Amino acid sequence: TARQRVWRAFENPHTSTMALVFYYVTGFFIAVSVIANVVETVPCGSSPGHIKELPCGERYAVAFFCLDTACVMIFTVEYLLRLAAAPSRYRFVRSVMSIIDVVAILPYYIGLVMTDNEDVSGAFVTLRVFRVFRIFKFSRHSQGLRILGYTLKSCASELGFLLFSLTMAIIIFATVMFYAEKGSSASKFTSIPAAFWYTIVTMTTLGYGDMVPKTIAGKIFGSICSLSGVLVIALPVPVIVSNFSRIYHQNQRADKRRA
Amino acid sequence: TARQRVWRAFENPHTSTMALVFYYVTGFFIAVSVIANVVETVPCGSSPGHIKELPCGERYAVAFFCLDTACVMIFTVEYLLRLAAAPSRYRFVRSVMSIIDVVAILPYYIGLVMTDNEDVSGAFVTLRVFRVFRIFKFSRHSQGLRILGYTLKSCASELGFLLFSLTMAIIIFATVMFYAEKGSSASKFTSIPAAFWYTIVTMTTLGYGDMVPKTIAGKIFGSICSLSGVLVIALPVPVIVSNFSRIYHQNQRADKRRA
Amino acid sequence: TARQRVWRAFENPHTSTMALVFYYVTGFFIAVSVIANVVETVPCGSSPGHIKELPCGERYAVAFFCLDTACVMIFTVEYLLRLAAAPSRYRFVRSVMSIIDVVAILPYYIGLVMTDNEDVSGAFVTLRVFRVFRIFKFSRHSQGLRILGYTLKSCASELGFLLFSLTMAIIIFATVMFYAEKGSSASKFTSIPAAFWYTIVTMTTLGYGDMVPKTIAGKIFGSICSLSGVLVIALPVPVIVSNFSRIYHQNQRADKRRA
Amino acid sequence: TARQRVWRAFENPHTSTMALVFYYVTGFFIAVSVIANVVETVPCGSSPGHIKELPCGERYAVAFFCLDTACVMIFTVEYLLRLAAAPSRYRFVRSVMSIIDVVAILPYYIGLVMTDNEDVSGAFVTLRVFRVFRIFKFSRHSQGLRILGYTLKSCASELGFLLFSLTMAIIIFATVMFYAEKGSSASKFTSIPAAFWYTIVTMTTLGYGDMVPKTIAGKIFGSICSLSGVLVIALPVPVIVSNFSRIYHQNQRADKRRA
Ligand SMILES: [K+]
Ligand SMILES: [K+]
Ligand SMILES: [K+]
Ligand SMILES: [K+]
């Protein structure tokens, strides 16, 4: 019963005070690691003996490294204990949660085994972009009433269909806008993939304004794209609202049929 | 009886006629204070002897000071009339509108007790900002503002967690976008907090365009971010309208139970 | 019965072939006058003997004036016949339709009585801005199933309330942004009315990008304003949808209870 | 029987297996043609002897011409197989998908009959634009595209009149905004059609910001225009979702009547 006790402590933290406090402690380290990751890019001032101000992640290299290694030791101990007290270890590993945990904790170890190649370029940048995966664990720790998740998986069909229609519309409008605008002077529409950016920014009603049409045909088709973008942003709202209300009432019905 | 008579004159001023008069007088004074606050920052111009065109609040500082102190005298006397006529002084003081009144009137007296050093900087700006909360006193003049407050109080936990998830998505997108765009030339994505601005502007479908991606990876993730903004537009609507409908329907049921 | 015949020809065009053709003819002149008004501002090319290319409204002054006077004679004859065949002439005049008709036809006559002051400035510009009022007549001629109008007048209460809340939010956010951003260099937030523009452009999720925050406090409050703008644009959709469906079903119910 | 056997193989290719094979082959060829069209505009670069980096469509024009003519040979033979196996040649030819097929394949043969003069300019761009309508042939591969087409055909008159009203509002706002902003310095509101661009960009809540108001009156009317864009976002949703629900519910009723 010891292994089942540790497991029921893990996926049901509220049962035991010690389980609850371990839950809150690992949540706190996830939060501090996320905040440290965000902070270690902020350029600290006073530029001590440097041509340009160094970010807090290079000026205080050892401090942020010690904080990172404390967080990663906590995460690794968590994952090892979960792998121990898992009833079906293979099924536990196959869960997307363990995948996220391992791909979040790996960057630290992979950087530690490449300290000799400290002058590496490009690869470590992606490696430590994957250090943003700890926010996923943090979102998991707030596993409140996920009516929104149920609504999203209820609407998944129409959302994927809208994504496919949006892809077709993006390709069509990008072709049209590129051919209308390839001939302008210093034109930003240098290719159809280049016009993909303008199209996706227009159909979402961003309009950054870096790429704008400069020709009458380009402006006509940009207007058509704008209207289709109005439709794009507007359509999901009523159906998401309806599905949310439906699942909400369904959950109260389930609660009452449990009483 | 005078205490409770004045109280009833206050919270149901439609019963009496002098109470309605005082109601409309204090509403007028609130409007006057708000309009004076807005206008006194407008550059009046045409001021000889000063190269910089002073605002109407410094060229005619005497008139605006007299107007604001008259408005705050009205607010102070009406607040003391509320307090003196309350059946329960503690309950009224703890009530949110009392906090609104006190946060509206305290800045003037704080400026009075600070005026010994007219060279105050950094604090007077905060006082001026808090001088706008006199507009919140219009809730007493609008059942719509009361029902909006009740709706927001109902949408407390769920909008809180929705904002938490939005913040988590902002952190994720800011991380990926900073690391995609830190290396560009004269880049504005100088840190992850710096890219917080781009992420929040994109996820809301503003697209100021002041800072836009310039790399292929940055543009791919900006496209994903805007597409997620399409869902950001629709996410709060279900729960906001559901809570509003709940409040409205219990109001209807209560009004029918009255009949 | 002659006057009632002319009236029933006017407000019920489909009855008589001659009534229908007069309806279509006056619709066609409204369309041609609108198109002429739009065109007479387009700068025609070839710049014949001019420092700068003249618009089609000054190069062909007589042609556009003759087209305008033909349209205005048709409109005046229409309005005179309506005033004749009106059963209650005073009530007919008091209708907003006759107000729009007279304020649309007046610009021509008022310009004709001020041809001596052909060098007038400013006033005639507004006078001929009111020449855009003919589009209102044109929209009237398409008096199809106005379920949208009924829905809008059904939602008028909540729409006005949302407008009032938007006004309060604009004033509050403008005060906050101006005080956060008055101190920047070459700042566009030179007053609270100046920040009205930024606020209204942000809460509607336009983000032109001419006025953007440049300070950390300004960016924080611009983010709050952006989120409130998401709420602003998102909220009307479900309620308009519900009201539209309700009135739609009500209209089919009315049609069937008429059968 | 061969005619009808092949026909059934075409419009219900799930029945057979060789029909499913030909189905997936032609879907693959449609995807290949679309991707080739997009890619061949991308500047390949690294081309010695040419200062301008040619697109992949001119550096490797032979490969892309062979690929496109192979795709169009497949399209031509499959179209002639549809036509030859149709029970009713006229009904099939008049059917919209036949128009899609012919408008997809005609540009290639028009280019073939134009190739005697390879210096064609202005027409070849139109042919290239119409070469994207091969993407529409994916409707045969998506029940979602068919139901979207049915919905749009249902939302024919009402969206038409909604677009008419939107155009009328665009004309009104463009008139007032041009006359508010014609007098500014280096103004981009050079005509009412010039302000059509600003009006459509603002009413859709894009706000590129390329052309923004610079006058107080221009800013007031731009605020009104954006506020109207808030309604523009919500206007088509009721009728679009109502018609979609009608189509979906009659589909459900038919499928139940099957059982
Ligand atoms: K928008
Ligand atoms: K912009
Ligand atoms: K926008
Ligand atoms: K924008």
UniProtKB/Swiss-Prot annotation, chains A, B, C, D:
- Describe the effect of residue 239 to M: Found in a family with atypical autism and severe epilepsy; likely pathogenic; disrupts potassium current inactivation
Describe the processing and modification events after translation. Phosphorylated by MAPK in response to signaling via the metabotropic glutamate receptor GRM5.
Result after altering residue 233 to A: Loss of channel activity
What effect is documented for mutating residue 159 to A? May impair protein folding
Positions that bind K(+): 205-208
What are the start and end residues of every segment in region (S4-S5 linker)? Answer: 143-156
> Which portions of the sequence are intramembrane?
193-204, 205-212
Q: In which residues does the motif Selectivity filter occur?
A: 205-210
* Domain remark text: The transmembrane segment S4 functions as a voltage-sensor and is characterized by a series of positively charged amino acids at every third position. Channel opening and closing is effected by a conformation change that affects the position and orientation of the voltage-sensor paddle formed by S3 and S4 within the membrane. A transmembrane electric field that is positive inside would push the positively charged S4 segment outwards, thereby opening the pore, while a field that is negative inside would pull the S4 segment inwards and close the pore.
UniProt name for this protein: A-type voltage-gated potassium channel KCND2
